[PDB]
Amino acid sequence: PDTYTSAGFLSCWYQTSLILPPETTGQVYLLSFISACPDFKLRLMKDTQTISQTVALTE
Amino acid sequence: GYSDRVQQITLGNSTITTQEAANAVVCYAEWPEYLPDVDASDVNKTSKPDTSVCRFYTLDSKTWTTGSKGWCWKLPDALKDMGVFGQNMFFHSLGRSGYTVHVQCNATKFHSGCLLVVVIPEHQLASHEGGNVSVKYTFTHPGERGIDLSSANEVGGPVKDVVYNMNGTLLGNLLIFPHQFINLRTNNTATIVIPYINSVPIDSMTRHNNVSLMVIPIAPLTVPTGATPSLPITVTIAPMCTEFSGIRSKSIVPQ
Amino acid sequence: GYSDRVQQITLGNSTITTQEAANAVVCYAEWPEYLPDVDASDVNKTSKPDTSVCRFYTLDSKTWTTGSKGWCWKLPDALKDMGVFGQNMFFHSLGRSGYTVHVQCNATKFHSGCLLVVVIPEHQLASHEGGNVSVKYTFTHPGERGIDLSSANEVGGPVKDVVYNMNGTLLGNLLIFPHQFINLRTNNTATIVIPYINSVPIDSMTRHNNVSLMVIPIAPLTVPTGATPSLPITVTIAPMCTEFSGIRSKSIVPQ
Amino acid sequence: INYYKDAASTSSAGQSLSMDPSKFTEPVKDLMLKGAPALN
Amino acid sequence: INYYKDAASTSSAGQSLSMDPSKFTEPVKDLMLKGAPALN
Amino acid sequence: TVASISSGPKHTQKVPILTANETGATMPVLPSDSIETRTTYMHFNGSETDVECFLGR
Amino acid sequence: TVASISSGPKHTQKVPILTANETGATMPVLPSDSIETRTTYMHFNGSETDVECFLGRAACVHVTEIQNKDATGIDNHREAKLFNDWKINLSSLVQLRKKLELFTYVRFDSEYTILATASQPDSANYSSNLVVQAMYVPPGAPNPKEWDDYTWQSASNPSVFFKVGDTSRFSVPYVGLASAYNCFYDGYSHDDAETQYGITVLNHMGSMAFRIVNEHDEHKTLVKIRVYHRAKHVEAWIPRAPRALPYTSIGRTNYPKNTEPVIKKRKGDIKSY
Amino acid sequence: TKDEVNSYLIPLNANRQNEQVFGTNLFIGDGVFKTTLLGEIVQYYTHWSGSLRFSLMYT
C-alpha cells in the first residue's frame, strides 16, 4: 500500500432493502469473490511478506 | 433466453440491472436526441458534458405504507443538486435534456399492491386555495425530496388531492400519459425513457420544469401476516443527451 | 496590413484583442491537443466540456510599483474556482488541460519598465527554512491570489527570493523556459500557449500543479514626472483542450 | 553481438544525431524571418 | 550457441506465450455465453 | 493488443454482469460490460509471470 | 559542412541584426551577418555533447559501510552495521545530481558497478576473504532484520555475490512507474495539509541491502561499499536553469540560509576589463 | 478475532433502508484482499495495473 499510488474504495448499500418471506427469519449472507480482468499486468518480482522462518526445517 | 423481464441499462459510469422488469416505455415512441440545427435559434455552440452528466443519480428513498397517497418529483428540479449535472444547470442560461427514469420496489410473492408510475409533460399544479391564488416557486421546486401528496396543505403550495392529479383532472385518466405499473405480483421496477418535450428548442432549467414524474399507490400495499407493514420505493434517474448553452455567472434562485 | 502587433484570440464565448503584441510563444513549439488512445491508460471515456471550460478567465489584478519583486501563480490552481472549469476539477478523479495565458500591462511612451513572463514546467519550490523542511500544501495552492514574492516568509511556505527562482537557480537563466518580455516601450501584452506537459497521460488536478506562470519586474517601473508611481498588471488565462475523467463524489482539499 | 537477452543489458545508445534547437530558440507562433523586421 | 552436449545444460527456456485460462476459469460441461442467462 | 475497447450506453435484454457462480465458472467480465470505456492498448505481454521466469532464479 | 560562408560588404534595407527579444525567440544570427567572412568548415559533429554521452559515464552515487564481527550479543544488527542498506536514490551525491537536474523528466536503464574494499584498522594477523551479498528489497518485501535471516534467502529477489576488493556489475531496466523519472515534482501524494512535498514522495523504489556472508574471524574487518551508476539509453525532456545554490536535502529544492553571493563581484567598475 | 468460516460471510438485515452493507479500501496487497489467491500472487510482484472483477453471490 502506497498513497500516491492508491486505488479508491468499494462500498455497498441497500438500494431498496432485503425482504424475507413469511415463516423465515434472521440474517442472510452474501459470499464475495475477487479475480483479475484479462487487462491485468503484474511486474518486477520480489519476495512475499507472507512467509518467513527462523530455523531450517528438517525431516 | 432474453426475457422482457431482465434488463441492463449502462449510462456513463453507472449500470442498473433488473431481473423483473415489464418492458420499458419510451414516451410518445421517441428516444432522446440532441438539438438539430434546423430547429436551433440561439447562435451559441452548446456544451455536451456527456458521461459526466449522463449517468444515473439515485434520489433518496421513500416509504410506502398503507396510508401513502403518492409522491411527485419535477425535472430537471429533482436533479438540481446532483454532481456536475446540477452545476451546469445553475451556470448556463439555457440547457435541454431527456432522461431514463427507473423506479424500484421489490416485495415477496405474498405481498400485493400496485403503483402507477407516470410522466406528465407540463404538469401545471393547482393552488388548494381556489380562485386565482398562485403556487409559489419554492413549492414547485421541492428538489430531490419531491412533493408528498399525503403531507398537509401549506400556504402558497399546491393542492395534494390524489384523485385530481393536483390539477382538476381524474386519477383514472393519467393513463393517457406515458406510464407503467409496478404490480408486486408481476413487476418490481418501471422504466420510462423521456425525450425532451417543449414548445421552444431549449429553455431555462430553473424557471420551468418540463415533466413531473409521479408514483401513486393505487391498489394499497398489503403485507403478509405479521410482516412489517411497509416497503421502500427508490427512484434513480439519468439525464441523457444533455446540452447546456449560454454560460455565465451562475443563477441565484429563491430560497 | 497584418502586424505581429495586433491580435485577436476567441476561445469559447470570450475574445481578447491586443493592438500591441510581440508575437506569441507556443511552449516547445507544440499546441495543446487531446489525449490520444495510443497514450491512454485509464479505461474511462473522458468528458470534454468544450466551450464551457475553454474560455478566458481574468484573475484579479496586481499592482506593479517600484518596490515589486514579482508574482507567481500555479496551474491548474489559479483556476480552481473559475466557473464550470473549477467544478469539473473538484468532481473528477483525473483531468488534463493546456492553456492560453495573456498577461496585460499598458503605460505610455514616457514610462519605462520591463516584466519577464515565463512558464516553468514542474516548478518545485524550496522551503526558506533550508534543510529538508517541506512547503505545506496551502502554501503552494494560493488560488487566484497567486504568491507575492515581496510578501514575508511564512511558516511552511516557500522562500520568496527572486534572484533564485524560488528553487536554487538564478533569475538570469529562466530564459531557457518558454517566456516573453513586456517592455513598456515595445509591448503591452505577453501571450504563451501551453501544451499539457507531464510524465503520465492524465493526472490529479488537485495534488499536482504542472506549471507556474511567473511575472517578474526586471527593469524597474519608472513613471514620467509626477505620474502616479504604479501600473496594474492583469492576467487572463483560458483552459484549452480540457478533458476530465473518473467522475465521482467531489474532492475535499486542505484549508 | 548482444550476449544477453534483455534490452537493458546492451551498451550505450549511439548519437541522436537529431539536433533541432528551434523548439527552444524559436517557439514563436508566427514565424520570424531573419532580416525582415521583428515587429511589423 | 550451446557449448555443451546435454540438454539440461542449456539456459532457461523462453516464454510459453501459451496462456489459456479456460481450463481453470470455465471448466463447465455445457458452454456458457456471456450475456445469455446463466441458468435457463 | 487492445486492453479496453470503446463502448457506449447500453439498454439491453442481454446482461453480461448477472451470472450464477454456483456453476464453478469465472465468467470473463470486463470494464466495458458495465461502464462506457475508450480504447486503450496493453503495451505488455506478461513475460515475467511465465512459470519459467517465476521458478527460474 | 560549412562553419562560415564567404560574405562581403552589405548596404541593405534588410538588417538581420536588429530584433525584438521581447518575443521570446533567439534569432539565429551568424558572424556573416555583420562582418565580411571567408569560408571555413566545421570538421566536428557534436558527438560528445549528446545527452547519451553526457549522462552515460559511471558516477559514484553512494558510499556505505558494513563490518564482519561477532554478532554474539548484538541486539540490533542493523545498528552494528552487521549489515546496512541504502534507501536507493540518486540525489545523495550532488556531482551527478546537478547534471541530471538540467532536465525535468529523464528515462534510462541503469548499469550499477559496486566496488567493495576492506580495512582492518586494528591489529589483525591477516586480511580475510569476505564475500558480499547485495540484495534489492523491492518495496513491500520482507526487510532483513538480522544478518542471516530468511530474507537473505532472496528466492525471488535479485541478488549478487562478489568478493571484497572485487567489483560486481549488472544493469537494471528503467523501473519507473510513469513514462519517465520526475527530476522535479510540484505536487503531493494526496490532498493533505501536512503531507510532504516534492519527489521524495514519488521516488519510493525500496532500498538495497548489503552484508558479508562470511562468519566472523578473530579480528574485525570494515568493508566500505561504493555504488557507481551509469545511465544507458537516455531520453531527457524539458531543459531547466542549472543549479546555482548548494543542496541541503535529497529530493527538495531547498538551499541553505545565509548562503553566499553566487555571482562573482567585479574587482573594479562595470567598465573594468 | 480468530480465523473463522464466518469472515467469508457478509450479513444482510431484513427491512433496513438507505444503510451501508460493507466498505473496504482497495489495497489489493493488504487487508481483506491479502489472503485471497489474487492478493497472494500480487505480493510476488512490485507493481500491478489493470481491472479487478468483484462479484457477490446471494444465498
Ligand SMILES: Cc1cc(CCCOc2c(Cl)cc(C3=NCCO3)cc2Cl)on1
Ligand atoms: C532514479 C532512480 C533509479 C533507480 C534504480 C532502481 C533500483 O534498481 C535496482 C534494482 Cl531493480 C536491482 C538491484 C540489484 N539486484 C541485484 C543486486 O542489485 C539494484 C538496484 Cl539499484 O532508483 N532511482
